[PDB]
């Protein structure tokens, strides 16, 4: 099921919906694309311009807010598309942030239209788009030299993963006192930029939290309690060939994704052991 | 640090792995089979086809305790014979004789019940079984085991025995003989459409009296069985000692004779009109003295009305007809 | 010496007297009048008019002894009341107890006499009246009495008290529970025209099965009242004992909820089939988690079934019916 | 019921048969009698001839050997006679004694067609009629210048009573081993010519004996049971005014009719001492 030449230029992310039907892309050319997908069959259905610079990352909303899509970019702003009444128009716009960013993400639907966005001015804000137009920018300072990644964690109590170019790996709760997402936890191992971070939607007893790097290792955070340890497991002892860039979890099973700058995808279980092999 | 070539693979509902292809200007979209992680293949099958023998099979052997086990050897049950045949076979059955009328009661059989209670002196329960059976035979070897243990004692144990098996006889005979009028009505009430029978025990329940001592009960109960040569026969017997008490009583031998005839007869003749329906040998002889005397008197008209209260059998009575009627004419 | 004038009397038959006149010659015949020798003319009277009341007033003044009297006094009573009358008088009534039950039986008043002998703890006799009475209401009353003294002793009494009374919610709750099996066929006897009520007593026992730890005893009779519910609970109690057990059987967090889930899963699904007739919340969960493990297989289609078997009130379950609906299509 | 001037000399006999209804009359024209009787009317049936002298008595035999007479006479003779086809004759004639018969009697049913017979010779017959024809008559020395009255007791063994001329009653008694009747009993009182003796048929516990005289008196006999004294009892304290000829026993009762010399008839019954008194 190949969707062969989507864009003209190199595409930086692609991702389906929450049915898993229905395709966004995003590149180089500064352009949104969305896809209707069926068998083996794809269909155009329109391509969203806005964008100034690359666009980084994309991601849908849950259909009970609607058919809307946040997309980040390289022109350090954040715009979220709609598909109502049969076609696709920008709606918002966040531009908070003084600087490229990075990545972008929905909340569990529990909590409602938050989008967790990340930069590389080191800032890291939320939004929550009201449903009376305005929007009020809960912002904090996460990471020296650039946030890259951030991931909420499963619905329970609100977590979030990000990662930086200061090579460490946080983990933020939101505190009523100080209304805002305050620091839980600092997590290091990494030697070099951090590139993605993802947190597990598995619902067992245990957290899975999966960092990725510049320094070519991946490494698993496991906890096995709310407060109390994070342990670090590194996937594996070697280190990969090129610069590992993207790490995704499977809606079932702790099944993990890892695409590399050697262009290969590596899927990962877990052992007995507590340790990772191939699947 | 910002754009370069990255498969940046996304999970997606469905098992789906979306990435980028190695280009970087296309997507692939594809379902990796994972290790540990399978499409039910058996259960898919077994829920459409509706046979769960081979799910059953795969479950037996991948069983993991005792309880487990069990439950799965439930199913293969449930599965082979069947939910109706399996009820059937589990609900069945193999102080214990106690347990045994418990069987009977549950599954119907009254009949069992009652004898094997029978059979090991549990008599009460045995009548509180047959309270509701209403089969007839059964109530009858209930009420034949109380009478052959509490039967012949009291004298409502007695009572209660004739009005079940239906029969005075008994009661005629022993019962206590103060409790005469009881016995009585258990006559009234044994025989409303049998004349024959009732007279028959009223008279044994009179001579019973008699022979006890209770003349004036005794004669109450001849006079209802209507029978004259019953009370004749306690009138008899009070005779001579009757005869002897007006000689004393300053009266001649004839005297005495002529008016103990004249009062018994008198007596007899009264008590002879309130009664149904005469072959007393003893009584024909009184009678016939009484003629003697009646035809020494001159009176042939009532001669002949007491000769014809008399068999015509006897030849003294056929010539005694025959002399008033030559007489008289 | 010879010849001479005489009148040569001869008596004959029928007090005449023969004799030859004074002049010699001729045969006077005579009936002398002889003194204490009459002819009975009231006797005479009585026979023909059948009216014995002067008879009456002359020998109740001529009475001799006292026996004599009593015989007269008699015929004094039977002569103005009447034969029919006087029998009623002379036959009738007035441990008296004991007595008095006598009374009411020979008298027809099996009423009377069941109460009786209740009120004076004869139960024996106050059941062999009961027995032949096919009157109904006091056969109750005698039942009554009898489980008022030894109803619920043994095992057999209890048995007789839901057999009597036609109620088995005594027998399900204070019988011996390993005689599980005839509380079975109690039901099965007491109703087998009432579904509803026959199911309520079923789980009844069966909860008592649990209670008690026959477990099972209970899912047989929880097949058998055609409950998923029961079974569900039964199950989901030993749901999270069965799940970390398969931790220790050297299996990964994850490989010990996807097997749980799936065992007990594709169990529950094999037995809701042999069953006739699903809101326990606890079941509904579980159903829950395991659509998001089989959709995260690619199976949409086996999802589906499951999710149509679960009530759509929830708008968890409405959300995931529509998710998948899109998802495959 | 008078029946009126029946013969033409003086009466000396009447006797009604075993019903009461038939009437045998006899006197001193050697001849007897019979009469029908019915309410106050009278019917001569016959005239019966064969006595060569005076009649002096009748009786009649019970009705089961028919209708037979026996008379007795002056002449000697005892003739029987019978009513067979309505014609009177006679059939058999008895001829033993030597002088007058005064007397003439049948036994009881019970020892069948036997005739007491009493004579002036002394001699007293007793006399079966044999049905076959021919007789064998018993005949005994009784009485001293002779026999007047001769009468049967009743049936129990058989006995009968004398009255003689030599004043005296005799009971006798028939034994087997002499083939004969033989003396029981001479009972002595009356001081002339018995005249009549008479048994009452009184089936009591007592026998009663009317002897009856020329000495103007009469006797009861009296007997209390089998074997034992004959008690004497007078009958009145004072003598009669005339002869006494007759005595004569009621069927049932026990009263006496004793026919005097004077005519007169005199009735009599027994009271309570044991005395005699007037009925």
């Known amino acids: ?279 | 640090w910002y754009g370069e070539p990255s498969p940046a693979a996304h999970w997606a509902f469905g098992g789906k792995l979306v990435q980028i292809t190695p280009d970087g200007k296309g997507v692939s979209i594809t379902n990796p089979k994972i290790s540990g992680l399978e499409s039910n293949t058996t259960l898919s099958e077994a829920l459409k086809t509706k046979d769960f023998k081979p799910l059953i099979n795969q479950r037996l052997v991948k069983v993991i305790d005792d309880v487990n086990e069990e439950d799965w050897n439930l199913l293969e049950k449930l599965s082979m014979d069947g939910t109706e045949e399996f009820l059937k076979e589990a609900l069945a059955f193999d102080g214990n004789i106690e347990q045994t009328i418990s069987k009977n009661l549950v599954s119907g059989n009254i009949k069992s019940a009652v004898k094997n209670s029978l059979e090991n002196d549990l008599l009460m329960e045995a009548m509180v079984i047959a309270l509701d059976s209403n089969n007839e035979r059964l109530k009858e070897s209930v009420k034949n085991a109380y009478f052959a243990k509490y039967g012949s004692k009291s004298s409502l144990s007695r009572i209660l025995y004739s009005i079940s098996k239906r029969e005075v006889d008994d009661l005629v005979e022993n019962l206590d003989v103060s409790q005469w009028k009881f016995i009585s009505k258990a006559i009234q009430n044994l025989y409303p459409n049998d004349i024959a029978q009732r007279n028959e025990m009223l008279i044994k329940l009179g001579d019973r009296l008699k022979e006890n001592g209770h003349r004036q009960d005794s004669l109450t109960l001849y006079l209802a069985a209507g029978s004259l040569d019953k009370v004749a026969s306690i009138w008899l017997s009070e005779f001579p000692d009757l005869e002897d008490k007006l000689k004393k009583d300053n009266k001649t031998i004839y005297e005495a004779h002529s008016e103990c005839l004249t009062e018994f007869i008198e007596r007899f003749t009264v008590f002879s009109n309130f009664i149904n329906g005469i072959n007393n040998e003893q009584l024909i002889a009184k009678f016939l003295e009484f003629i003697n005397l009646t035809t020494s008197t001159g009176n042939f008209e009532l001669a002949t009305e007491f000769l014809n209260s008399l068999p015509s059998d006897n030849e003294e009575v056929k010539t005694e007809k025959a002399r008033v009627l030559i007489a008289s004419g």
Chains 1, 4 share one sequence.
């Open chain 1, 1 to 279: 099921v190949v969707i062969a030449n989507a864009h003209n230029e190199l595409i930086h992310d692609a991702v389906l919906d929450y049915y898993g039907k229905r395709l966004a892309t995003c590149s180089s050319d500064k352009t949104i694309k969305i896809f209707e997908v069926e068998g083996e069959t794809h269909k155009l259905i329109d391509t969203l311009t806005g964008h100034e610079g690359p666009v980084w990352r994309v991601d849908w909303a849950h259909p009970k807010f609607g058919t809307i899509l946040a997309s980040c970019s390289y022109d350090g702003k954040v715009l979220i598309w709609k598909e109502e009444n049969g076609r696709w128009s920008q709606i918002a716009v966040h531009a908070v942030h003084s600087a490229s960013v990075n990545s972008v993400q929905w909340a569990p639907h529990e909590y409602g239209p938050l989008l967790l966005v990340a930069s590389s001015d080191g800032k890291v804000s939320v939004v929550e788009f009201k449903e009376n137009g305005t929007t009020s920018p809960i912002i904090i300072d996460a990471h020296a030299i650039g946030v890259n990644s951030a991931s909420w964690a499963p619905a329970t109590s609100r977590k979030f993963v990000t990662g930086g170019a200061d090579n460490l790996v946080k983990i933020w709760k939101y505190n009523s006192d100080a209304q805002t997402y305050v620091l839980e936890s600092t997590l290091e191992g990494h030697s070099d930029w951090v590139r993605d971070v993802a947190w597990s939607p598995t619902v067992l007893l245990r957290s899975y939290l999966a960092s990725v790097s510049q320094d070519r290792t991946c490494i698993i955070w496991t906890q096995d309690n709310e407060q109390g340890p994070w342990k670090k497991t590194l996937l594996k002892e070697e280190k990969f060939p090129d610069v590992l860039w993207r790490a995704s979890w499977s809606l079932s099973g702790n099944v993990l994704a890892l695409s590399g700058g050697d262009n290969k995808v590596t899927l990962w279980k877990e052992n007995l052991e507590g340790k990772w092999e191939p699947a």
